[PDB]
Enzyme design. Sequence first.
Site, PDB file in Angstrom:
ATOM      1  CB  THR F  23      64.011  51.348  62.941  1.00 31.57           C
ATOM      2  OG1 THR F  23      64.271  50.205  63.707  1.00 31.57           O
ATOM      3  CG2 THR F  23      65.195  51.481  61.994  1.00 31.57           C
ATOM      4  CG  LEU F  59      68.147  54.151  67.497  1.00 32.58           C
ATOM      5  CD1 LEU F  59      68.606  55.578  67.199  1.00 32.58           C
ATOM      6  CD2 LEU F  59      67.386  53.648  66.274  1.00 32.58           C
ATOM      7  CG  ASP F  60      68.022  49.217  63.660  1.00 32.66           C
ATOM      8  OD1 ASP F  60      66.795  49.378  63.875  1.00 32.66           O
ATOM      9  OD2 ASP F  60      68.491  48.987  62.523  1.00 32.66           O
ATOM     10  CB  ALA F  61      69.543  46.520  70.113  1.00 33.29           C
ATOM     11  CB  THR F  63      64.104  47.624  65.720  1.00 32.76           C
ATOM     12  OG1 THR F  63      65.491  47.750  65.559  1.00 32.76           O
ATOM     13  CG2 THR F  63      63.608  48.854  66.480  1.00 32.76           C
TER      14      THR F  63
END
Lengths: 83, 83, 83, 83, 83, 83, 83, 83, 83, 83, 68, 286, 52, 52
Positions: F23, F59-61, F63
């Site tokens: 992240t 992008l932050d899925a 994680t």
Amino acid sequence: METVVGLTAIAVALLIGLGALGTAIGFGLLGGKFLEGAARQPEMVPMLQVKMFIVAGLLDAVTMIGVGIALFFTFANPFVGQI
Amino acid sequence: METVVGLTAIAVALLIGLGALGTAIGFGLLGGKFLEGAARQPEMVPMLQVKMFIVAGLLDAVTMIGVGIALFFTFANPFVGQI
Amino acid sequence: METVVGLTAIAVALLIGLGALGTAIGFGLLGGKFLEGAARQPEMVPMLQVKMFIVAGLLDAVTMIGVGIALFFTFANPFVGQI
Amino acid sequence: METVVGLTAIAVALLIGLGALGTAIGFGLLGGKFLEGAARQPEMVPMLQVKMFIVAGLLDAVTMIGVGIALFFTFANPFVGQI
Amino acid sequence: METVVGLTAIAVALLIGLGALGTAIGFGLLGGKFLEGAARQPEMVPMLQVKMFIVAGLLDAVTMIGVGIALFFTFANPFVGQI
Amino acid sequence: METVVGLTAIAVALLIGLGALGTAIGFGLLGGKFLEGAARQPEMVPMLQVKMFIVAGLLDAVTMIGVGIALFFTFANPFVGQI
Amino acid sequence: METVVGLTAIAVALLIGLGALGTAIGFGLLGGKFLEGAARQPEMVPMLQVKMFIVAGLLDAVTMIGVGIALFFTFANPFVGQI
Amino acid sequence: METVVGLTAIAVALLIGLGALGTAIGFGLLGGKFLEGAARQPEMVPMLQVKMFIVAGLLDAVTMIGVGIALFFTFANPFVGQI
Amino acid sequence: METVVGLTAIAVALLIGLGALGTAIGFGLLGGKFLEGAARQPEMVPMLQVKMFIVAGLLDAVTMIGVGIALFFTFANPFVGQI
Amino acid sequence: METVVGLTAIAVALLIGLGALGTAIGFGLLGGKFLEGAARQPEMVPMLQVKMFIVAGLLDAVTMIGVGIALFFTFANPFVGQI
Amino acid sequence: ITVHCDIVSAEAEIFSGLVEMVIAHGALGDLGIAPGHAPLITDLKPGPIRLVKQGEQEVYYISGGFLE
Amino acid sequence: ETASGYIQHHLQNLTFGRLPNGDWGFAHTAEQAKEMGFWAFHVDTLGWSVLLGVVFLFIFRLAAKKATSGQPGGLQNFVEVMVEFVDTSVKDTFHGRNPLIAPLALTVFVWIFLLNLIDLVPVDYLPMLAAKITGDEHLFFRAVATTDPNATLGLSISVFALIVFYSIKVKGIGGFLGELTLHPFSSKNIVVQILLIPVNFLLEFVTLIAKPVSLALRLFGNMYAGELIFILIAVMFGSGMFLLSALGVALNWAWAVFHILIITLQAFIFMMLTIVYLSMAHEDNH
Amino acid sequence: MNINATLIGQSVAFFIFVLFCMKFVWPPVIAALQERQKKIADGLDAANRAAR
Amino acid sequence: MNINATLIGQSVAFFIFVLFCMKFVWPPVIAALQERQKKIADGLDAANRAAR
């Protein structure tokens, strides 16, 4: 027996995890350049898509062998039958 | 018996996983420059394709050795005979 | 007897695997700029191709020692005779 | 049972940790180029957006196979059955 | 002697493997800039090629020490002489 | 049972750690291009900021899937039930 | 004592291998820029080559400290003394 | 008891060390572009500074969760209570 | 203190090894931009060299604390004194 | 007790070792763009220098937390008191 | 606050005086130019340039040229 | 009671199951709830989800009923801002004429936002009032609906049913199966095409199945971590210590202020992905 | 965590809600916005008709 | 465990969050809808001035 079965569980995570890591970064690099070329030359988009897929075929070749062998080590086990 | 057999699953996972990681990242870097060159000079694309395939041979050479040794360690394991 | 044979299987996987990882990324970097240079100067491709092979010899130099020692450790193990 | 179960927590954490590592870096590469294309060409944003979502499905595909098999090792266990 | 000998194989694999990984990535970076310079000014090639070998000597210096210590630990052993 | 509890603590750390690593590097890539695009023309900063939040969801899925499963392992434990 | 010795073989391998990895990648980045500068300004090469050796003294500063300590742990051993 | 206590000290080093590694590289990527954009448009610095701090809060989002769970594990211990 | 003494040899290798790795890669990036600026505008070298030494202080700040602690654990030992 | 203390020495090496690795790479990425900004806008270097220190405090935020905890573990180990 | 801007052609001038902001279609993406921008030489695309002036707005079509 | 017991109690739902005693039955312990089969329902999760849906419908319909045509009423002004914001987001993402995407997107955004909004109040206010009203001091009860995987999965499976339905409706059954087997790789000869159909399915089927699974877990992760981080902050005050309680209140406020971003982003992102995924079931990209 | 039929009840309520709002929440508001659009458009055209 | 002290501490945090909300978060969003309320009246009026 339990050390061979336990190490096989890690072998499967190592086969799929490194292939997932590699293809995700590989497509970030390849696809990033496709969007750059598509932005400058929007007339080239239908041709460039085909050319991107050629590279994707080389990029997924070894990773597919890796996830195929990983699934094989979960539903079957060539090591457990060798002890 | 079990430690040699169990650690050969980890050895096979490392030979294919590390090779897959390198090949996936390597083609993302190579193919990304090929699409940039194809967008810049679309008249030279037939020539850039053959030049890319010259490099693709060098890029996968050691990876093909590692997946060939990993399929040798999987079927008829060479370390079991040593003990 | 079994621990040295188990640890040497992973030592061979580190030698081939880290070498495969580094050379696949190295040729992705080297080859990416070869295609960019050839796409920029179409008439210079036969000159750039010989220069790329001079660099390929430096790039794979230490990697060939890794796979050479790994195949030596696989068939004619020098550690199993020191215990 | 204690070693196979304690080494399955490490397996699950490598499957989702390496997938989280790669997809967050990958969408940082793909998205960093989509935002540049959107800044260079304000009229191409709807086309660049649909092209980004094609690559986005390629980028997380193998990671989702790893997030899914990790959830399966977390609420079921194909190894423990292997006693 | 058994654990010292087993760990020496991994020690050698790390010395040559990390050296091969770094040298292959290092020549990919140095090599790409030599080809970029050769494409920009083909008259400068005789000079750039000599400057590349001056850098190649600095780049491989520690890698060759690592391969030398790894070969020393392969045909001899300073740890085993200490029981 | 202590091996299961102790390897679960490493599982939580690898699962949160490799996600925090992904992240932070992923948003450093996405964010860096957002500021460069903002520097090209300030009238589009609000439009680009809306596009950045849409990509942050890709992008932050994975994680956060790791943070969710890790926080389910910091207190509860589905592996202890498996004995 | 056998553990105190065997873990110093791995300590030496990390201490030289991580140094070799960093120094090999570091000179690829520094040297690639030296060739780029030399092609742009051939008349400045006498000055640029001297400035590269100033940076090379900072780049290898910690790597040489690592190699010095690794040879110290190889021919002498402040750990085997159990002191 | 001692295995959980010893493996949780390393779990705190992975939680804070992987977060430190990601946050330090992520700000080198974001801040390198902030200084490049501030040189491009020195009159827009107040606007770019606010947009940079908005993204900085997105980098140090999962890292602060891990630095808070890692201080919980040094002054209290959720694993030790499980025996 | 075999455990305390042994694992401390690894601790010193990680302290100096990770510090060497980061410092060598960091100066490759910083120095590559110094040579680029020196070739772009040669009359700025007196200023650019002083600005590079200001950044070099920040770059090595944590690496030098790591080397300081590594030499403290080599000749003195806090862990062996705590028992 | 020795396993808690020995693993604590490695926890310490991971806390500051990963912090040194990330801050050196992060200041090479950040500092490299600062020298470029100073070469393009020489009269604005006093502003660029002031803007850089705002990012330096954020780049070192989580790394200094790791250094503080590492010294705490060495002189007042919070795990030895947990039986 | 206000930057001097001149639109000039080989045959005659097109615009002159101080301005607040200039929007131009450059060779590799569009640009938003404001007072204090860094030295930039760039080929323009065939398209319009919008010149913001202390608040009123001006628009001129151009067929190509160089933005300095 | 120990803190492990308080955390373990908060992490349990109110499950309803047909125990032999009578027609209606409720779970009394965590193990007894875990023994119940899939054919059991979380009373608390569903209760908060249907109620907030009806609350949203009621405040929007009261306004939709009193449409002033000209100058909008105080509440109607907000409803119109939401309808215009969603219509703008839809028109910018989808260029077709289907009337179902905008009502779905508005519902998805406002409903998920309210399902997450009940997380900002102190974590044990609602459980204690529910226990006292019910007359059972040991009742299991969770207010936030999105911290249950089943709620997020119900949303994504519902969206996925619409994605498959529209794809089949406009492309035809043979055409839909064709996209999953004839693209992206194709060739001028049948002998090569038969070798490409497994590769095409291996790419399309994996990238199709990842949409419903990622949507649910993407929404669940941030919210479940938010509720559990509030539970860990809530335990800090339980010590009664002055300096530790002072740290707890400062962390609670800082986390709550950070969560105002998260509540908004997760609802907005699920809406945008819903619009995007539906819009690509009406178009072709090869 | 635990897997239940809870998703059914919420999904069924959502499918019915999605069909209802399309007929009783969107049409009144979109019509009230289309009227203002038409009024602004024809109001601006009225000035062009007067000017002609 | 001082349950009552936890309810008071969390209530203080919630009160501080609402105080912060009234000071910065709430004023712009409530005012933006009221400025839109004015913009709608001014637009439609202008269309009615043209109709006259």
